[PDB]
Design a protein around this ligand. Structure first.
Ligand code: 3PH
Ligand code: 3PH
Ligand code: 3PH
Ligand code: A1EDJ
Ligand code: A1EDJ
Ligand code: A1EDJ
Ligand code: CLR
Ligand code: CLR
Ligand code: CLR
Lengths: 415, 415, 415
């Protein structure tokens, strides 16, 4: 383990170097602010270089993922799996938003805000939604343009685009190959910047540690943040999933919880939703007698497009950062956070600590200071390893639920 | 006819429901204006959702239509048909603009305005012409940017694009198939919104009926509007087409008018330029002895890209709406209306009442309030059925004129 | 030569007509300024019509040129030729900028300007870099948006795009053919406007001659400009290339200079880097005994993507025009001029006087008045014919240098 996972070693060296350089330069002096910005400048280069690559990334991944990979699944298993997967993620995101508003760390009318949301959902002109959002000002009222991206309009129009390409069928094969080429090129350009990343994260940690003005209250609210995400994760993966199992299936949930309770240990141990599939296959198809005809369809897709924990942690860590810089949020933006939590949970998957890459979608959707993500990155070496456990549990309970809903269908397709 | 044409029944129910809800709520009270906007809100959603789909619609239809469908017609019949078709539409649009300025319902220098037009025709930067127009302000003068789309610059550049793709030939077959795929996808997404449409048109009729402040003067100017479009249609389809026949052909026009005078009845009866082709083929190739070698080329394309009536009605109903809200127009915009009347007549064709879809190109070109189109939609159940008659007559007279211009060419290609 | 090169004859007639019309109308009267703008208006139409075609031209030429034409050259000859070609052009551009700042014709902090440059190099949102640049204003400081294109961000991102398409290999053949089609279409649309060009250049010469307010001081600084570019060309093609030859090769440079000294005469005579290849092949492969295995790779590509003279003349004629209208330039823009001199030298090649087409990239990168290029176009009939000589010499010295660096490689690939 000395030379393997070279990027992990480099990020550890970067965080350690940035922490000790902060510990030197904070005890150095009251610093001139422009040399502080000059020191934090590689972090700003990393943030601007990564926000460069969410416009072709959304556009390419939405049309590669939707049309071309929904192509003729099982007629009932596909829609049941998709209903469960877009149900539990939305429920987890609403639970995360409710918890981070209730605990409250980090210490126009509402009807016009929700009309503002519905107006921003359907964009007027397309190129005037790649960089400008419509908002409502006072005097009567009028509607003008604030800066910042409009993520909801693009995701709405391109979801309608991908679905309308799926129903054309075999005629459109000069387009899905084009967008697969575009997605592969954009992903290689993301790999380049993620190889550059640790020198950016070191300077950003230094820039957020030197100019922080207090070394205690930030640690207090960070501990409060970790308390919030732990309590949200345990209330979801303890109450909300076995209740959904018990309402529909009318079976005892702990008897299902036994085999996943032995798989859950290595799920915590390896922190990957992709690493635990050879374990959970031997767990699920043997310890509970689940049919082979449904697990090969509902588990490997469930390890990718269904991660409740990376919705909970993401939608809590957005409104934490909003409640650090004083920017209170209204109902025209809480729905944006709770929807792009769903639309940013399904993207970045199958890897340890992928919540610190797909956060940059939400941190530009709601219109927030993007350059404060480093106060997350020091406290995620303990947080991801239990988040992946709920990512595993949310796939296993769906593998139970779809199988109990379609046992009759499997038996009538037998004979 | 009870269940057939389901969208027509739903639009009738929507207009009737919106009219009776206006007749209730106007006699209800002086209404608070924000609940009036809340009631009219689905109409605003329909308008913004339809202005979402004119940027890929123009871009896709211009390059699907030009390069790929001009591919090797007859060498003389094609250019003669195109000269006649882009002649009579421009003449009809100028006649409509002149009539609606003369009757005048709805009760910077000019040289700098025309320089402003020529500057907006050739756009400086392409992405700064999808959402911003260049205008000239006072103090010396200077040139700055007003908001609103620039339709003329995009239509100019993409017409040059489609023509420059037509002259490349067989090399570019990885592009025209791409844009055919894009056009089919955008047309299916238009079909979705036109299925949503009647619930939008009902709420927009309610929002324009409640806040109208007078129930008599608007009906007076609407009757004046119907008078203007009827007088323009009769002066065009009575004088201007037989004069063009009589100058070139030196033949009596009523003898040509006999067979189209019996086809004209079912042309008024069915209100479609596509429904009258099996009638007008039996009329034209038999009652006048027109050659089969030219009618199969000049009639079915003439039923699509040559509709003088949907230029006249369109270019009158734009400057009516401009003269309702007081916005007087100058020569930097009258040319925009009279040119996009031509470039919006050739697009939306072969259907009853297609002038209430392609109006939204002109209503965003000239920079007008788009949300007042519903005062057209109550008075078009009587206006379209005679407009399609002139659409038929404008194809039949061209079928006569091109045949008389190329009778010698047909006889010398015989032997 | 009476009817051949018809565009050259038309440009000569246009320049002569514009000069004599200036010589009449300057001795006519103090002119009203708006009819002066009306006379100069076709030149403004030509400038806006040509700035229309640098956004698809950069995007198409960068991905046609990079991926698809670097495909498996020689493993060492390719990188040695590319190192020499991107070395001498950058050295020539820095020498040109230094000379035009030193002679000085035409009579925020710097650290924040260079941070502004690094911020504009990596663009935040892509569509907000096709028309808007980020700049830093005072009060603390803040960062806002000035108008004007951002050329460096697009060239950076699309260079990374073309390189990341080159490493994918055979999978992406539905993209490079698409962008070859786009490049051919955009080049035909450039051919159309270059056929329109002389009527534009005549009116622009009239508009810059009538409103010039002095007939002597402009000629004095134009003579100073010609002095600057001649002195820069002679110091480069006399000192800097034989020094680079003599440091590495340790051979006498005049013995190499003999055969190119007889080729140099017809290089001055025909003013084309494409016309002198049959001469320089017989010169180089015979008079110096250079191997056939390297000249067929390093000469015909060197006649296209390596022109030091069209970097020197270009990067001097940009900062001349900046120093005519008083607009002094700082270090946030001098790097932009000296980099887009390199990235605009490699594009427009193999033709007499191609520096008056690719100038319009730099004249919109630095944010300058584009409509003053005509004071170049009267004094380039004497300047291009010696510029092409240095274009030839810069290829011949590289053909010597790469051959001496790889003589051992050629001998070990022999046996
Ligand atoms: C640094 C920047 C980071 C930004 C992160 C962006 C990541 C992507 C965010 C966008 C999310 C969507 C991308 C596409 C899905 C992931 C890509 C993928 O590989 O999928 C694998 C997966 C196929 O798996 P594979 O075969 O293993 O590739 O794709 C799917 O089958 C599911 C795709 C779902 C698409 C998202 C749906 C969200 C909206 C839910 C509503 C659905 C329509 C409702 C209609 C109205 C009611 C009738
Ligand atoms: C809700 C939004 C509604 C917006 C409505 C937009 C509808 C399209 C508006 C844009 C109009 C152009 C679209 C393309 C034509 C219609 C599409 C089509 O199906 O065509 C069928 C037709 C082929 O018929 P088919 O074979 O039955 O499909 O296409 C044509 O052959 C004619 C295309 C004409 C294109 C418009 C020309 C207008 C400019 C006239 C000047 C011509 C060049 C002059 C050069 C300078 C002088 C030398
Ligand atoms: C009116 C508007 C005028 C505007 C003028 C724009 C003209 C193009 C300007 C953009 C210049 C780039 C265009 C592409 C090259 C010319 C096109 C062409 O035909 O090439 C022929 C040539 C192939 O020749 P052929 O086979 O005869 O076509 O292409 C090449 O092989 C060289 C292409 C070089 C591309 C430019 C490189 C400049 C950046 C240098 C850094 C390189 C990466 C460093 C990586 C970091 C360090 C590891
Ligand atoms: C769909 O949109 C998104 C959004 C955010 C994203 N974040 C990411 O990390 C990645 C990821 C990556 N990117 N950078 N490094 N890795 C891995 C580390 C590594 C790279 C090279 C050598 C050794 C280790 N790739 C690169 C390669 N992976 C491999 C997949 C199996 C397990 C790890 C290796 C996956 C995909 C994709 C991604 C896609
Ligand atoms: C080129 O750019 C444009 C601009 C404006 C446009 N307006 C439109 O109406 C349409 C039209 C449509 N769209 N929505 N409904 N229809 C028909 C009603 C219907 C639909 C489904 C079931 C029963 C009835 N389509 C849909 C299908 N048509 C069919 C064509 C033969 C006659 C009617 C049916 C034509 C094309 C295209 C169009 C294209
Ligand atoms: C890569 O980006 C760029 C940037 C700036 C550019 N400037 C240009 O001049 C051209 C050039 C052109 N364009 N217009 N005229 N020519 C030639 C004059 C001519 C045309 C027709 C008949 C007789 C003479 N073409 C057109 C055709 N050439 C031919 C090539 C061999 C020598 C001359 C003829 C070259 C390419 C391309 C170009 C590409
Ligand atoms: C928010 C910005 C700074 C991105 C976060 C930067 C760092 C911390 C992120 C970006 C990409 C991530 C890496 C992506 C891939 C792997 C391979 C896996 O086997 C171990 C984790 C590891 C090594 C991740 C560790 C954390 C990581 C290096
Ligand atoms: C003004 C805006 C809202 C667009 C107009 C909305 C409604 C009235 C328009 C849009 C599309 C139109 C329909 C398009 C297609 C058909 C099929 C035809 O056989 C009967 C008419 C009918 C059913 C049209 C009726 C009017 C229509 C429904
Ligand atoms: C600043 C704008 C107007 C560009 C300059 C306009 C004129 C002077 C430019 C544009 C294109 C140029 C031409 C491009 C091609 C050729 C063919 C070559 O065998 C002789 C030179 C000649 C004829 C060039 C002469 C100068 C030229 C005509």
């Amino acid at each position: 383990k000395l030379g393997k996972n070279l990027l992990l070693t480099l990020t550890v060296f970067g965080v350690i170097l940035g922490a000790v350089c902060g510990g030197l330069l904070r005890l150095a002096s009251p610093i001139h602010p422009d040399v502080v910005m000059l020191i934090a400048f590689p972090g700003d280069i990393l943030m601007r270089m990564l926000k460069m690559l969410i416009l072709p990334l959304i556009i390419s991944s939405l049309i590669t993922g939707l049309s071309g990979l929904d192509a003729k699944a099982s007629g009932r298993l596909g829609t049941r799996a998709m209903v469960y997967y877009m149900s539990t993620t939305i429920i987890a995101a609403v639970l995360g938003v409710i918890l981070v508003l209730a605990i409250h760390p980090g210490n126009v009318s509402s009807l016009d805000a929700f009309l503002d949301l519905i107006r921003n959902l359907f964009p007027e002109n397309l190129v005037q939604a790649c960089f400008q959002q419509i908002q409502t000002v006072t005097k009567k009222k009028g509607l003008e343009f604030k800066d910042g991206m409009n993520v909801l309009g693009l995701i709405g129009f391109f979801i309608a685009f991908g679905i309308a390409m799926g129903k054309m069928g075999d005629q459109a094969k000069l387009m899905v190959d084009f967008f697969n080429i575009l997605n592969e090129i954009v992903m290689k350009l993301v790999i380049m910047i993620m190889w550059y990343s640790p020198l950016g994260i070191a300077c950003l940690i230094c820039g957020k540690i030197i100019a922080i003005k207090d070394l205690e209250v930030v640690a207090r609210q960070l501990g409060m943040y970790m308390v919030t995400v732990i309590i949200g994760l345990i209330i979801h993966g303890g109450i909300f999933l076995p209740l959904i199992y018990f309402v529909v299936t009318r079976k005892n949930p702990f008897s299902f919880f036994a085999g996943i309770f032995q798989a859950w240990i290595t799920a915590l141990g390896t922190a990957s939703s992709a690493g635990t599939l050879p374990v959970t296959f031997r767990c699920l198809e043997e310890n509970l007698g689940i049919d082979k005809r449904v697990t090969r369809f509902v588990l490997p897709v469930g390890a990718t497009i269904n991660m409740d924990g990376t919705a909970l942690y993401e939608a809590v860590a957005a409104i934490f950062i909003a409640q650090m810089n004083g920017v209170v949020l209204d109902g025209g933006q809480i729905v944006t956070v709770s929807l792009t939590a769903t639309l940013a949970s399904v993207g970045a998957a199958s890897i340890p600590s992928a919540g610190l890459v797909t956060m940059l979608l939400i941190l530009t959707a709601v219109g927030l200071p993007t350059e404060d993500i480093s106060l997350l990155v020091a406290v995620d070496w303990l947080l991801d390893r239990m988040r992946t456990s709920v990512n595993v549990v949310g796939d296993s309970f769906g593998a139970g639920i779809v199988y109990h809903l379609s046992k009759s269908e499997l038996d009538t397709i037998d004979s």
